[PDB]
Amino acid sequence: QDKIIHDIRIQLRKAATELSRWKLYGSSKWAAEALAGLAPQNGFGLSETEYDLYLLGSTLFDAKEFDRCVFFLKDVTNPYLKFLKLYSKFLSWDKKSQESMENILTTGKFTESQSNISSILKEINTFLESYEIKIDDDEADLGLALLYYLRGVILKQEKNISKAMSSFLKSLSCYSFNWSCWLELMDCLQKVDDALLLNNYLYQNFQFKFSENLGSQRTIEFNIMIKFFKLKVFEELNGQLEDYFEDLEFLLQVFPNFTFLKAYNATISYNNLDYVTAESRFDDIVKQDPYRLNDLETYSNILYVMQKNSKLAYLAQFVSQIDRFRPETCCIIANYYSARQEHEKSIMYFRRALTLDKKTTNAWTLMGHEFVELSNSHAAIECYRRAVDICPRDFKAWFGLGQAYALLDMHLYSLYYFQKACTLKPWDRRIWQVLGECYSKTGNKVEAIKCYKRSIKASQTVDQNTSIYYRLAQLYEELEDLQECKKFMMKCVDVEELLEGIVTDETVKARLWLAIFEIKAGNYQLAYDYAMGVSSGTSQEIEEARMLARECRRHM
Amino acid sequence: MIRRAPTTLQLSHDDVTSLIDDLNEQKLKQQLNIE
Amino acid sequence: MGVMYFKKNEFVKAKKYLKKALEVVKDLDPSSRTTISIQLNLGHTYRKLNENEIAIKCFRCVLEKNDKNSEIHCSLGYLYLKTKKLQKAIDHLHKSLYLKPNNSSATALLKNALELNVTLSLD
């Protein structure tokens, strides 16, 4: 610490004010909020005849008259005053840019297209090409980073991810400590192997512009939010972690009582399915900052699994009391309706919350689940698709399509959707088993076993492995490996001893076939032993087991 | 004076069906070698 | 003239004249149904010539120039299906069917992709 924390305070004071000055609400809110957690330098290149336009531009933007800003700044040659017009021009297009099929579900009404941004991207390219100083060397300043950032997000609109990464990393090099810039970089991954490749790029190829930044910040490893970059990437997708634990500890010592860290740290527990510890971590945040509402839907999601409806209802009352039209509030209230088995009304509140951001967290998927319980099976699959298009990194979105297509007769489409989610979260025990179950329809028995055997290893607890052992024998029965059927079917009989003789229906089928198999093999005494082992189940199996017992005694 | 869209052609049905048939040939013969 | 020589199944002079046309119009006509059409036709001629390598790149640059087009996506899926890159072509097929409703040939190609995925046992 020592001067390191002090140097952060001064530069973070900057990133709080200029970002808020040039109408970047999202980035400035994190930085300004970071001052409170942390334990008037003014300057810009502008002229008096041009300074009025900034006041003219800024105050109209605050009054939300978006379109008039473009006209009043029609001919501006300032390096970064041009950015506010194009930024306003971009949002003016975006509000009317709703895809027809997503809109139908978005509202339920059931009733020039994109060339504008094509001009916007060309306008940025023409300006930078004709601008005096490029990004190279120690030139450029804070304003030029915003242009590249605005350029990058527009490229992402046309699904130009490959060039989008180059633009964003170029912008971050010129100016760092901009949080909104890194959020758009997250959606550009949609893969696991590229993260380490990008990590290699940051460690070796990437370099900072020390001219704008302060001391001890040009270096990548003394930087404080490069740790924030590493925290965010390794929680959206685990993969293989590098210095994740060590770097997390250092950032915790600094930034005391920082709510965002605690919410992220607590969210890690939910991703680890440690529900009991997650609530305690969530609860402390509520006491400290009752009026912070961000990522409170995760709190509602954990309470949904525990089904503590009494606490959840009060949670919904508290959130809705102070604000009634934020996306997390309607999402929490809508999640409440799922607890009351009123899945038919939960759609309306998810519908309302979706219109608020239309790029949310996994609220599209929760919208899809409520249709499944209604048995629409057609709104849900289309609703699931939209979550894929927005965030292709969502496990639940891919899994929803595969599960829904499993109910549909055509199981062919379920293989591909399950395969993508398999790469995203290979650690889950269910997905491998479900993939194998649907893959048995393919008739390629060899690959299911490789999938089936990995399901068994990933299933942890042996008791739940009893059901899938029987699935193994049936597939081996389709091949000339009846001996292999017996040995795994023998294993589930052994698990009965481990599970204190639950003698469930799964082992009832296991016991009768082995007795029949050993009778076919001439082992009457051995088959007679399992004959009395089926002492419970349905009537037919009791009678069938007795005929086997009677037959074995005759042969001895 | 105005120009309409110039003539452009896409994948026909005949050629795509021929490629489908070929794909079935090399997805039919290789499992015989495996078996 | 290039489409003419493509219709007669010559596949050589068509490519030559179309390359001449694009090299004439490299500087100008960045958008507006001229560069897209000429580049798509040259890629289409290359697919017919079985030179799929330059075809992937030219279709990719056309796609990054303009995203909303079912024909370009269908042809790129066809190109990938010519090789063995089914993982990177099925997504294109699904997006192409998303853009345009029927796409019967695209539906057939996607279905065959499903049988291919079913047959294969990649780790």
UniProtKB/Swiss-Prot annotation, chain A:
Post-translational modification as stated in the protein's UniProt record: Phosphorylated by CDC28, which is required for the early mitotic activity of the APC/C in its CDC20-bound form.
Superkingdom of this protein's organism: Eukaryota
Annotated protein name in UniProt: Anaphase-promoting complex subunit CDC23
Family assignment from sequence similarity: Belongs to the APC8/CDC23 family.
GO function terms (MF aspect): cyclin binding
Keywords annotated in UniProt: Cell cycle, Cell division, Centromere, Chromosome, Kinetochore, Mitosis, Nucleus, Phosphoprotein, Repeat, TPR repeat, Ubl conjugation pathway
Subunit annotation: The APC/C is composed of at least 13 subunits that stay tightly associated throughout the cell cycle: APC1, APC2, APC4, APC5, APC9, APC11, CDC16, CDC23, CDC26, CDC27, DOC1, MND2 and SWM1. CDC23 interacts directly with SWM1 and binds the destruction box (D-box) of the substrate cyclin CLB2.
Localization per Swiss-Prot or TrEMBL: Nucleus; Chromosome, Centromere, Kinetochore
Protein purpose: Component of the anaphase promoting complex/cyclosome (APC/C), a cell cycle-regulated E3 ubiquitin-protein ligase complex that controls progression through mitosis and the G1 phase of the cell cycle. The APC/C is thought to confer substrate specificity and, in the presence of ubiquitin-conjugating E2 enzymes, it catalyzes the formation of protein-ubiquitin conjugates that are subsequently degraded by the 26S proteasome.
GO cellular component: anaphase-promoting complex; kinetochore
Effect ascribed to mutating residue 59 to M: In CDC23-4; G2/M cell cycle arrest at 36 degrees Celsius
Effect of residue 415 to F: In CDC23-56; G2/M cell cycle arrest at 37 degrees Celsius
GO BP field: anaphase-promoting complex-dependent catabolic process; cell division; positive regulation of mitotic metaphase/anaphase transition; protein ubiquitination; regulation of meiotic cell cycle; regulation of mitotic cell cycle
Effect of residue 79 to S: In CDC23-41; G2/M cell cycle arrest at 37 degrees Celsius
Lineage: Eukaryota, Fungi, Dikarya, Ascomycota, Saccharomycotina
Known outcome of mutating residue 503 to I: In CDC23-40; G2/M cell cycle arrest at 37 degrees Celsius
Curated annotation (Swiss-Prot), chain B:
Residues with the Phosphoserine modification: 12
Subcellular location: Nucleus
Function: Component of the anaphase promoting complex/cyclosome (APC/C), a cell cycle-regulated E3 ubiquitin-protein ligase complex that controls progression through mitosis and the G1 phase of the cell cycle. The APC/C is thought to confer substrate specificity and, in the presence of ubiquitin-conjugating E2 enzymes, it catalyzes the formation of protein-ubiquitin conjugates that are subsequently degraded by the 26S proteasome.
Family: Belongs to the CDC26 family.
Assembly mode: The APC/C is composed of at least 13 subunits that stay tightly associated throughout the cell cycle: APC1, APC2, APC4, APC5, APC9, APC11, CDC16, CDC23, CDC26, CDC27, DOC1, MND2 and SWM1. CDC26 is required to tether the essential subunits APC9, CDC27 and CDC16 to the complex.
Protein's UniProt name: Anaphase-promoting complex subunit CDC26
Covered range of the whole protein: 1 to 35 of 124
From Swiss-Prot, chain C:
Start and stop residues of the TPR repeats: 1-27, 33-65, 70-99
Subcellular location: Nucleus
UniProt superkingdom: Eukaryota
PTM notes: Phosphorylated by CDC28, which is required for the early mitotic activity of the APC/C in its CDC20-bound form.
Function: Component of the anaphase promoting complex/cyclosome (APC/C), a cell cycle-regulated E3 ubiquitin-protein ligase complex that controls progression through mitosis and the G1 phase of the cell cycle. The APC/C is thought to confer substrate specificity and, in the presence of ubiquitin-conjugating E2 enzymes, it catalyzes the formation of protein-ubiquitin conjugates that are subsequently degraded by the 26S proteasome.
Known partners and oligomeric status: The APC/C is composed of at least 13 subunits that stay tightly associated throughout the cell cycle: APC1, APC2, APC4, APC5, APC9, APC11, CDC16, CDC23, CDC26, CDC27, DOC1, MND2 and SWM1. Interacts with AMA1.
Sequence similarity: Belongs to the APC6/CDC16 family.
Other notes: Present with 2753 molecules/cell in log phase SD medium.
Name used for this protein in its record: Anaphase-promoting complex subunit CDC16
Organism expressing this protein natively: Saccharomyces cerevisiae (strain ATCC 204508 / S288c)
Residues of the full protein shown: 639 to 761 of 840
